Design a protein around this ligand. Structure first.
Ligand SMILES: [Zn+2]
Length: 635
RNA sequence: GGAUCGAUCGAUCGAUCGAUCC
C-alpha cells in the first residue's frame, strides 16, 4: 500500500517536471517509480499512448524490475517488455519500442540503437526513469543517452521531449573538499541529467528511519607483523632473481625511471610492469638469440611479479596462503614450459621451500590483524549467534585465502564459506547484512555494526573525510532545495550549454593511417604472427585474421567461461603455437557461421618494415592503420 | 574480444586491482 512517505517523494514528479528522486530504500524507490509510471500513463487523454522507459544497469536489477513491472501493470492492459544482451539478437528493436509502453531496456542497448540508426529521434519515449542515476558522470551509457537528449534539445529541433525523472540513493560528491565544490558537483549532475527538482523527504522524517540502513562505525587501526622471516626469505629470492636477470640486460635499472622500489608494494608491481613493457621492444639484428633474451626477461619479470603478489598476500592474508599461492603458480607453470630457465627458477624455489614450509607452520608467526579479526568475530557471535556477516576484501586472490583460513582455523568452527547455511559471505564488491567487516577495503537489521580493519591510517582518514563529505552532501542538497526554480533552471541550462560546447570542442578527426604494411609479433616469443594487411575489423571494435598461414600459428584451448555478446559466440581461447610459449593471443568465436580467432593488440608488439621500430600498443583504438572492413565475400 | 565505472599507485597521462554491460 502506498503510504504518505512514498507520496511525498512522488509529488514533485507527478506535476510534470524532471526530478532526481532519491531514497535510501530500494523497495521504496521501486514503489515510487511504479507510482510515477502509473500517474504518468493514466494522465494521457484518449488517442495518445505513453512510452515510459526504465533503465536498469545490471542484469539482476533488470530482471527484478521486469518482474515487478509485469506483475503490477497487468490490470491496466499495458504491454511491458525488456531488452538485454540475451534479447537484442535478430529482433527488430524498432518493432519492440513502437509496439510497447513500459520497455525496460538497458542503457547500452539504447546507445547502440541511437548509434546504428534505429530509433532516430529520442522523442519516441515520453518518460525516462534512470535507476541509480548517480552514475551519469562521464562517457557512461546514461551519460551518452543524456548527451543525445541534450543534443536534440539544444540543437534547435526540440520536439515532444520526455521527462528525465531520475532515481538514486546518494547524489554523490566525487572529490569535493569545500561546500562550494560539492554544490557545483550536484548542479553538474542535475544538469547532465537535466532536472530542475531534487526530491527529498523534508516533512515525513518521523517514520523515515524505522526500517532503513541506520549504520555504525567501529574503526580499528592495527599494526603489521614484526618477525617477518617469510618476507626476508622472499626478498632474498627476488633479489637473487633480479640479480641473475641483469646478466643479459645491464641497464635494467635504466629502463624504468620512477623512484626507489621496495618489495611487497603496488609501486614494485608498477615498476615490474614498466620494465616488462620496456624490455619487450628489443631490436637485436639476430632475431634468434633476441627471442631467447626477450623470453628470459619475460619469465624473470613474471616470476618477480608472482613473488611480489605472494609478498602482498602474506602481508594481508596468512603465510600458508601465500605459500599455497606460490606453489599453485609454480605447479601451473611447470606443466606449460620445460626450458632450463624455468627449471633453474623452480629448483631454486624448491631449495627455499624446504625451509619456507617449516617457517609457515610456526604458530608464533600468526598475523595480528587476522588475530583480532577472529577475536571480534568470536565476541560478536558470542553476543548473537544469528549474525550474517559480510567480509569485503580488495583482491580476488584473498577472497579464497580467507575462506581457507576460516575453514582451517581451529579457534572458530561456527563460520561457513560464503565466497561470492552460509554464515559469513566473503565478497569483493556488490540482504540481511547484520555485520560488515571492511578488511583492508576503502542495509537492514537495525543494530548492525561495521568494523573497518586496516594497518594504515590512510584508510581511517579516508573514511573520516567520507563521513564529512556525506554530511556536506546532505547540507548542499538542503541548500539546493532551498532555491527556487527560475535561477536553478538558468544555472543548469548554462552548465549544460558549456558542457555541450566543450564536448563539441574535443572532436578528434580521423587520424591519417600509415600506408606501410607493418606486422605483429608475440610478446614473450617475438615470432612473426601476421601482417597488418591481413587484419580485418568486424564491428569497429573486433579484429581478426583471415590468413591460412595464421590458422596453424596458434593452438585452441577450452574457455573457462563462454558467453555470447550480441554479435558472436565464444568457443575457446587461442595460445601461441610454439615449444614453450603458451602466450594468450585472443579468443576463438563464431560470428554468423564461420570460426574466427579474434586477437587483442594488448598481447602483441607492432614492428614497422620501413624503419624497424618496435612499438607496443594497449588498445585497438590507439593503433592507427588501414582498417580493412571484414568482407564475408572472401571467406 | 570491446566499452564503461570505481579504488589504489606512479610519472594531464600510464599501471594494477575489482565490478558492470554489450
Ligand atoms: Zn610466442
Amino acid at each position: 500500500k502506498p503510504r504518505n512517505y512514498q507520496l511525498e517523494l512522488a509529488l514533485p514528479a507527478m506535476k510534470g517536471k524532471n526530478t532526481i528522486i532519491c531514497a535510501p530504500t530500494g523497495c521504496g524507490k521501486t514503489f515510487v517509480s511504479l507510482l510515477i509510471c502509473e500517474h504518468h500513463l493514466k494522465k494521457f487523454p484518449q488517442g495518445q499512448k505513453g512510452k515510459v522507459v526504465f533503465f536498469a544497469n545490471q542484469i539482476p536489477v533488470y530482471e527484478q524490475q521486469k518482474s515487478v513491472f509485469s506483475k503490477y501493470f497487468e490490470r491496466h492492459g499495458y504491454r511491458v517488455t525488456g531488452i538485454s544482451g540475451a534479447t537484442a539478437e535478430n529482433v527488430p528493436v524498432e518493432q519492440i519500442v513502437e509496439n510497447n509502453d513500459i520497455i525496460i531496456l538497458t542503457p547500452q542497448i539504447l546507445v547502440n540503437n541511437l548509434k546504428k540508426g534505429t530509433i532516430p529521434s529520442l522523442s519516441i519515449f515520453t518518460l525516462m526513469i534512470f535507476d541509480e542515476c548517480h552514475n551519469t558522470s562521464k562517457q557512461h551509457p546514461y551519460n551518452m543517452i543524456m548527451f543525445n537528449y541534450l543534443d536534440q534539445k539544444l540543437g534547435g529541433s526540440s520536439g515532444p521531449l520526455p521527462q528525465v525523472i531520475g532515481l538514486t540513493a546518494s547524489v554523490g560528491v566525487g572529490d569535493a573538499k569545500n561546500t562550494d565544490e560539492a554544490l557545483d558537483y550536484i548542479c553538474k549532475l542535475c544538469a547532465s541529467l537535466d532536472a530542475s527538482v531534487i526530491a527529498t523527504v523534508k516533512h515525513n522524517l518521523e517514520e523515515l528511519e524505522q526500517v532503513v540502513y541506520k549504520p555504525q562505525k567501529f574503526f580499528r587501526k592495527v599494526e603489521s607483523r614484526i618477525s617477518d622471516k617469510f618476507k626476508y626469505i622472499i626478498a632474498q629470492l627476488m633479489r637473487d632473481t633480479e640479480s641473475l636477470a641483469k646478466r643479459i640486460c645491464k641497464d635494467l635499472e635504466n629502463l624504468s625511471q620512477i623512484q626507489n622500489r621496495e618489495f611487497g608494494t603496488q609501486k614494485y608491481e608498477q615498476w615490474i610492469v614498466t620494465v616488462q613493457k620496456a624490455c619487450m621492444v628489443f631490436q637485436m639484428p639476430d632475431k634468434d638469440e633476441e627471442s631467447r633474451i626477450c623470453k628470459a626477461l619475460f619469465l624473470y619479470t613474471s616470476h618477480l611479479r608472482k613473488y611480489n603478489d605472494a609478498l602482498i598476500i602474506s602481508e594481508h592474508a596468512r603465510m600458508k596462503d601465500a605459500l599455497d599461492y606460490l606453489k599453485d603458480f609454480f605447479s601451473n607453470v611447470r606443466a606449460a614450459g620445460f626450458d632450463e630457465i624455468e627449471q633453474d627458477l623452480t629448483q631454486r624455489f624448491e631449495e627455499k621451500l624446504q625451509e619456507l614450509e617449516s617457517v609457515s607452520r610456526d604458530p608464533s608467526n600468526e598475523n595480528p590483524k587476522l588475530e583480532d579479526l577472529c577475536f571480534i568475530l568470536q565476541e560478536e557471535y558470542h553476543l548473537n549467534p544469528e549474525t550474517i556477516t559480510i567480509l569485503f576484501v580488495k583482491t580476488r586472490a584473498l577472497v579464497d585465502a580467507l575462506k581457507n583460513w576460516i575453514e582451517g582455523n581451529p579457534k572458530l568452527s561456527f563460520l561457513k564459506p560464503g565466497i561470492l547455511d552460509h554464515n559469513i559471505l566473503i565478497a569483493t564488491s556488490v540482504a540481511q547484512c547484520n555485520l560488515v567487516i571492511l578488511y583492508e577495503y576503502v542495509g537492514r537489521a537495525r543494530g548492525s555494526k561495521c568494523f573497518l580493519l586496516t594497518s594504515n591510517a590512510g584508510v581511517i582518514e579516508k573514511e573520516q573525510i567520507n563521513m564529512y563529505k556525506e554530511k556536506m552532501m546532505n547540507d548542499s542538497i538542503l541548500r539546493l532545495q532551498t532555491w527556487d526554480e527560475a535561477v536553478f533552471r538558468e544555472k543548469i541550462l548554462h552548465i549544460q550549454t558549456h558542457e555541450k560546447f566543450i564536448r563539441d570542442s574535443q572532436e578528434k578527426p580521423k587520424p591519417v593511417p600509415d600506408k606501410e604494411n607493418k606486422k605483429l609479433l608475440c610478446r614473450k616469443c617475438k615470432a612473426l604472427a601476421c601482417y597488418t594487411a591481413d587484419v580485418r575489423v568486424i564491428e569497429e571494435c573486433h579484429y581478426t585474421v583471415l590468413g591460412d598461414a595464421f590458422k596453424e600459428c596458434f593452438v585452441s584451448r577450452p574457455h573457462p567461461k563462454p558467453k555470447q555478446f550480441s554479435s558472436f559466440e565464444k568457443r575457446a581461447k587461442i595460445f601461441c603455437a610454439r615449444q614453450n610459449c603458451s602466450h594468450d593471443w585472443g579468443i576463438h568465436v563464431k560470428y554468423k557461421t564461420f570460426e574466427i580467432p579474434v586477437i587483442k593488440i594488448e598481447s602483441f608488439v607492432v614492428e614497422d618494415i620501413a624503419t624497424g621500430v618496435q612499438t607496443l600498443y594497449s588498445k585497438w583504438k590507439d593503433f592507427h592503420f588501414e582498417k580493412i572492413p571484414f568482407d564475408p565475400a572472401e571467406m
